[PDB]
Each structure stands twice: as C-alpha cells, then as structure tokens.
Amino acid sequence: MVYSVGLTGNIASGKSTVAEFFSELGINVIYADKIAKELTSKNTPCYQDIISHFGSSVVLNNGELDRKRIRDIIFSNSNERLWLESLLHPVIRKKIEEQLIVCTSPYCLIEIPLLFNKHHYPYLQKVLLVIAPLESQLDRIVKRDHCTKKQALAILATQPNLEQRLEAADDVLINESGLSELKAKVNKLHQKYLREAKIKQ
C-alpha cells in the first residue's frame, strides 16, 4: 500500500489547519471523521443500524442523526461505545483502504478523529500529533462553540490525556505560534515524509 501518515490531536489544537496545509502541498488527506459522517448519513445502511439500536431519541427533526446525543451516550456507556465501534470500524476502514488504493500523492495523510484507536490503524508508517497551548485551545473552542471559557475548559477536561498520545507519536507539532510558522513546520514534516517514503520499502 501507500506510505501513510496518521494525523492526530484535537481540532481545538489546529489539526484541521495542519491537514489543509498538507493538502496545499499536494498531499491527499483522508478524513476519517468525514467518512464516519458520510457512512452514517440519512437513509444509509449504518444509519439504519444505529437507529434500530439506539431508537428514535437519537433522531433529529431532520431525520438526521443527533450526533451530540450519541457521543454523550457512548462516552458514559462502554457497552454502547463498543457496539458502535464494532459497527463502524470495519466499514470506515474499508472506505479508507479504498481511498489509499487510488491515492495519487507520494504519501497519504489520514486524519484520525480525536478518539484515536491505534489498533484499528495498523497500516500507518507514521503518527503525527498536533498540540497547542491550553489558552489557545480554550480560545478556539470559545469561538467555534460561542461557549464560555469555563465550559471550554470542561470540554477539554473530558478529552484523553496526551501522555499516551505523546508517547505513541513519531512526531509532535507544537502549534504555539502563528499560521506562517505552523505552515513552515508542516513543510518540514512534508520533506521528512518524502525522504522516508523514498528510501523505505
């Protein structure tokens, strides 16, 4: 398969911006969260499996899934979390693999959503973890959800501690400056992945 780099972190740390910067370098970026959404869109097969399991309470006026409600449920309920992971992991993985087959770039970037499950992604050559200072994260969450700083802090409080992620990452992008420097760092990582992809089989 193609040389694959896993992009991890939370969106409040600038993960989406980093992904876009890789795209700006001509790298195919596979968004696993987008895939998860597309696979659970209105009147899809998995969408019907989910409603059949969770019932009508996770259905909005739209007919669309109440994703916030589902996330809240599986966070506190491990049985439901494992059920949903068992449903979607196989289908998500097949969709990623399809994109990798038709990958046109020298290597591929795979944006893994914030709940990283490394076991379900054996095919990665590298893991890139994006982190940012706490204050920046709060600021970003505040603007994106118009909530309060205290609420933003609570939202962050329920996120996985970075110790394991930090150990399980081959590279850590500390997003603690502006966008020019962030882009500069992505460019350096880009050169690195090109070099490693060239000499490793």
We report the CATH number of the domain holding residue 115 as 3.40.50.300
User: Rounded distance, CA 126 to CA 144, Å?
Assistant: 29
Which of 98, 99, 93, 109 is CA-nearest to residue 36?
93
Query: Looking at the DSSP assignment, which residues form a beta bridge with residue 173?
Result: 130
What is the rounded distance in angstroms from the CA atom of residue 55 to the CA atom of residue 91? 21
Beta bridge partners, 6, equal: 110, 127
Range of the domain at 43: 1-201
The number of folded domains in the chain is 1
Integer-rounded Cα Rg, in Å, for the chain is 18
The candidate with the shortest Cα–Cα distance to 11, out of 111, 146, 124, 147, is 111
Q: Which burial class, exposed, middle or buried, applies to 181 when counting CB atoms under 10 A from its CB (0-12, 13-18, 19+)?
A: exposed
With helix as H, strand as E and coil as C, how does the chain read? CCCEEEEEECHHHCHHHHHHHHHCCCCEEEEHHHHHHHHCCCCCHHHHHHHHHHCHHHECCCCCECHHHHHHHHHHCHHHHHHHHHHHHHHHHHHHHHHHHCCCCCCEEEECCCCCCHHHCCCCCEEEEEECCHHHHHHHHHHHHCCCHHHHHHHHHCCCCHHHHHHCCCEEEECCCCHHHHHHHHHHHHHHHHHHHHHCC
Would you list which residues are annotated within the binding site for ATP?
12-17
What technique solved it? X-ray
Q: Are 127 and 5 in contact (CB under 8 A)?
A: yes
Per-residue CA distances from 52 to 48, 62, 74, 179 (Å): 6, 17, 16, 44
Integer CA distances (angstroms), 35 to 31, 111, 172, in order = 6, 10, 25
Residues marked as binding?
Answer: 12-17
